[PDB]
Amino acid sequence: LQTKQDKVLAHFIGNSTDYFKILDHNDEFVLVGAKDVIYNVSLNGLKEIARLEWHSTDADRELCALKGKHEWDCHNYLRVYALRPNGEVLLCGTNSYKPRCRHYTHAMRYEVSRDVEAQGLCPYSPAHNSTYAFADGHLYSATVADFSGGDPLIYRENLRTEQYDLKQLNQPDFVGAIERNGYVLFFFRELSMEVMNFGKAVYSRVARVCKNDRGGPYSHGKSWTSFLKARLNCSVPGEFPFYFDEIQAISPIVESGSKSLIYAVFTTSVNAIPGSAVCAFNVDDILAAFDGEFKSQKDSQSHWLPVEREQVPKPRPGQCVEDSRTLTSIAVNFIKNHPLMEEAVPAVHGRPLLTKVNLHHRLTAIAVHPQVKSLSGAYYDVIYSGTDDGKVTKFINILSTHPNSTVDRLKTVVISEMQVLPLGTPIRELVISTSKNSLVVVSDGSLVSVPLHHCSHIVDCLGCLSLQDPICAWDLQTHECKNLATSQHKFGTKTYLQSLNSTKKAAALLCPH
């Protein structure tokens, strides 16, 4: 008991073989894609509401086992859900390495409207290496097209990345896909070509495609004409920067004031000492990287600089043209030859928001409660991160202006680090329901509900101030640590105490004797 165990509110337990995956969630209900089943689960008590079962035919499982896969692989793990603009429901599952998609239509309705192949639209294995995004009525999938797992692609409406071309994709493991401003952004880690000796170094990338892409002319009609990617830069600055090059998870786009943010979790490679980090990226900075120079093709010398400014095609590559079929073969071949941008995307504040180095666990999940108003009146993003150990870490960031020198100092206020899952089980995903004050930890075979904020669970004044949660404040009128977002303060907060910009011992000093 070196770390305290968190107060588990509710639990939804399945077998370890289930390999749960969250498909859709809001503040009240969440969908869980599992082995042969997808679950509609209410968030107040983690109680099941609606169940849809879908099993592989014995013909499908037999051929799957004949294909050389084990029993746990020869099932139907549901991995793709989308609410179509017709009110229909789209469901796709692995189906024992024979992926298929279906359309569906108090009261539970389960009528199979359609059933068709899902090659390139759905993964073959429950492995969490692939992602998707349903944007403007189409499915933008990033997965493998083959049974062996050696043909990665990004696909949508018969438009795919170049097959067996390592310049666009080099053994990628996808971690997420976000729609934004007429683009679809993909986040993944892959092998690096830009290194001089082509060494097996993993780099983290953000890639984008135009949604209005209609392909190129002639043989380019089945390939993207707007595929670009840039490296993500999550590193500790210095004379010798310390990089976290393997992205592991991302959060949805967070709205923090006038800025749109994406929080991501990075780990170090196997050689550098084991390390984890949380970096945030500005969406305006991500989109700006695709306005820069193009990294030239890895020529034999490999010391080549970015492409000459006069060598880029007449319209800029990656710019969403109305009809991309009118583009020339020279312009389409160019963006196929130079899909990698020269400059990398810088992280917000130019450094990780949290680092974890030389520890017996790595960060795995991420979730954000944005713009929590502190007692003082400032707004902070409360960031949640999970580990392969089963722990959850709350923290906020405070940036100091001229505290000692003109250089700004960014500090990390760790709110709590508690054990949530059994000490062995890793944390796959994190879902936040602010209205129910619930953080839902997701493992392979369980959902666990723990309080999003422990204001109502602490009774001591010293603990209410030492917690340094921007949402918990201590009322002196009534000895009760109150939640500023949920609890009602009709008599005002003038008698409240909170200290976020101090030491955890300096905060408890403000608390009365």
Ligand SMILES: *[C@@H]1O[C@H](CO)[C@@H](O[C@@H]2O[C@H](CO)[C@@H](O[C@@H]3O[C@H](CO[C@H]4O[C@H](CO[C@H]5O[C@H](CO)[C@@H](O)[C@H](O)[C@@H]5O)[C@@H](O)[C@H](O[C@H]5O[C@H](CO)[C@@H](O)[C@H](O)[C@@H]5O)[C@@H]4O)[C@@H](O)[C@H](O[C@H]4O[C@H](CO)[C@@H](O)[C@H](O)[C@@H]4O[C@H]4O[C@H](CO)[C@@H](O)[C@H](O)[C@@H]4O[C@H]4O[C@H](CO)[C@@H](O)[C@H](O)[C@@H]4O)[C@@H]3O)[C@H](O)[C@H]2NC(C)=O)[C@H](O)[C@H]1NC(C)=O
């Ligand atoms: C992801 O994001 C991260 C975070 O943002 C990025 O991280 C960056 O990483 C790069 C490298 O990848 C770093 O570049 C190095 O920067 C430092 C510092 O440069 C600044 O400061 C210089 C002056 O500092 C010195 O002088 C002042 C007084 O003048 C003194 O007070 C101070 O104490 C200090 O002593 C400036 O000169 C420099 O400005 C220059 O560059 C500007 C930008 O181009 C330009 O605007 C200026 O006009 C000017 O041209 C800047 O302000 C540098 O130390 C370092 O320089 C080394 O590397 C280059 C590479 O070609 C080389 O040409 C240099 O000669 C130098 O190489 C020596 O140092 C190496 C470092 O140890 C050493 O390994 C070498 O062997 C070599 O050493 C030889 O000479 C030295 C004596 O000089 C001797 O000790 C050796 O034994 C040997 O004889 C780099 O420029 C960035 O700092 C870093 N950024 C941050 C914010 O941390 C990362 O790039 C991003 N990744 C991606 C993919 O995007």
Ligand SMILES: *[C@@H]1O[C@H](CO)[C@@H](O[C@@H]2O[C@H](CO)[C@@H](O[C@@H]3O[C@H](CO)[C@@H](O)[C@H](O[C@H]4O[C@H](CO)[C@@H](O)[C@H](O)[C@@H]4O)[C@@H]3O)[C@H](O)[C@H]2NC(C)=O)[C@H](O)[C@H]1NC(C)=O
């Ligand atoms: C998982 O479980 C929850 C719990 O039931 C479930 O949430 C429910 O969603 C349905 C919609 O699918 C909600 O029912 C709607 O209520 C609105 C009232 O505003 C009605 O207008 C809706 O009618 C629709 O269809 C009509 C024609 O058929 C149209 O005229 C109309 O415009 C609507 O389009 C519909 O009755 C229901 O309120 C919630 N339940 C709760 C408690 O909120 C969820 O759908 C389940 N499945 C998932 C998430 O896939």
Ligand SMILES: *[C@@H]1O[C@H](CO)[C@@H](O)[C@H](O)[C@H]1NC(C)=O
């Ligand atoms: C979970 O595994 C057990 C094996 O001990 C099995 O009996 C049970 O049926 C499984 N769960 C479901 C929902 O089938």
Ligand SMILES: *[C@@H]1O[C@H](CO)[C@@H](O)[C@H](O)[C@H]1NC(C)=O
């Ligand atoms: C995930 O997809 C990549 C894409 O190339 C593939 O190489 C890999 O085998 C798949 N599975 C895992 C576990 O990475």
